[PDB]
Amino acid sequence: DILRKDLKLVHGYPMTCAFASNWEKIEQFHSRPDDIVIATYPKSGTTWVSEIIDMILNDGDIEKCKRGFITEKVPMLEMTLGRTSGIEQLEKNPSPRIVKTHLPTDLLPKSFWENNCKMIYLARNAKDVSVSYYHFDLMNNLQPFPGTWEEYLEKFLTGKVAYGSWFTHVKNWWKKKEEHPILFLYYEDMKENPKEEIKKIIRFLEKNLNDEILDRIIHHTSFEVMKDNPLVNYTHLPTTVMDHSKSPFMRKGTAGDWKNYFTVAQNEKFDAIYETEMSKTALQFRTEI
Numbered sequence: 265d266i267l268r269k270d271l272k273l274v275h276g277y278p279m280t281c282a283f284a285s286n287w288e289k290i291e292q293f294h295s296r297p298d299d300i301v302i303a304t305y306p307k308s309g310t311t312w313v314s315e316i317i318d319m320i321l322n323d324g325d326i327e328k329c330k331r332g333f334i335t336e337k338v339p340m341l342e343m344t345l346g347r348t349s350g351i352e353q354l355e356k357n358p359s360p361r362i363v364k365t366h367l368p369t370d371l372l373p374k375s376f377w378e379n380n381c382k383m384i385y386l387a388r389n390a391k392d393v394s395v396s397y398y399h400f401d402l403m404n405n406l407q408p409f410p411g412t413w414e415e416y417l418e419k420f421l422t423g424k425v426a427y428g429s430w431f432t433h434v435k436n437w438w439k440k441k442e443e444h445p446i447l448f449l450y451y452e453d454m455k456e457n458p459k460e461e462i463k464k465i466i467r468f469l470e471k472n473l474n475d476e477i478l479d480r481i482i483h484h485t486s487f488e489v490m491k492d493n494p495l496v497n498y499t500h501l502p503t504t505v506m507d508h509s510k511s512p513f514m515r516k517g518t519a520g521d522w523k524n525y526f527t528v529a530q531n532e533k534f535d536a537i538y539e540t541e542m543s544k545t546a547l548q549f550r551t552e553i
């Protein structure tokens with residue numbers, strides 16, 4: 265029915281088959297002014313930063329952060345599956361709501377701009393993203409079968425994956441920085457110095473948290489702890505939807521993991537495409553820490 269189906273176009277972007285229907289519901293979504301959007305290209309650290317922000321908004325209270333599974337606390341806007349949809353769950357949530365999305369800026373519901381909602385756009389280097397997303401498709405049965413790693417990389421590089429080109433996603437979101445309240449963050453900076461990155465989020469949300477709380481947030485949101493937290497590690501989803509025996513959702517949590525899968529030849533070809541796409545932009549991603 266929806267499982268292992270081909271991607272469908274939605275306003276020019278390839279999309280997970282299940283999510284591509286009744287798209288008008290997404291377009292008409294009603295945001296609230298104090299909604300906080302977490303936006304990322306797939307596999308860029310959405311779940312990671314979702315749990316960070318939840319801790320922040322709950323003043324570092326761990327028991328509060330345990331009130332529900334991640335899909336209820338921080339729903340994915342565009343998700344639909346008979347699981348309650350992301351929008352239905354968002355309609356049930358108290359303000360300030362945290363909203364996760366992978367949508368290109370052009371597909372984000374216009375209400376979010378009209379309400380001046382704050383947004384955190386997190387970006388991750390395209391090499392680790394390709395590898396994370398490949399493995400994700402092995403386990404996430406809503407996605408097309410990715411094929412071999414070599415076939416998948418070619419599709420990733422041409423933007424023939426759900427949510428389209430990493431290049432376009434990152435560059436278009438970056439253009440929206442000057443005109444809207446958006447915090448731009450990088451997965452590699454968060455891995456390298458979570459204290460300083462988390463501090464950037466706390467100031468952006470106009471919050472005031474002491475250093476004891478800050479350390480507890482850092483500890484509670486580290487890969488080692490989150491991987492074994494059943495409220496955030498996606499083991500709560502039906503086996504039919506995500507089969508973690510093919511790849512766990514909390515897979516490696518490393519910057520540089522891409523090196524383990526890219527051949528030198530693949531690397532040189534990637535780099536050439538990357539240069540063509542990205543040389544004119546003032547973004548400098550790190551591929552290792």
Ligand SMILES: Nc1ncnc2c1ncn2[C@@H]1O[C@H](COP(=O)(O)O)[C@@H](OP(=O)(O)O)[C@H]1O
Pocket residue numbers: 304305306307308309310311312392395396397399485486487488490513514515516517518521
């Ligand atoms: N606490 C944490 N620290 C670092 N990376 C984390 C994390 N929690 C999740 N991730 C990583 O974020 C990626 C998934 O992102 P998203 O939530 O946007 O789908 C995965 O990368 P890997 O597949 O490289 O391990 C996942 O392991």
Ligand SMILES: Oc1ccc(/C=C/c2cc(O)cc(O)c2)cc1
Pocket residue numbers: 280306307335340343345347366406426501505
């Ligand atoms: O109940 C569910 C809750 C969430 C999900 C997430 C799906 C998903 C789909 C994508 O194309 C990209 C992605 O990064 C995640 C699926 C089922």
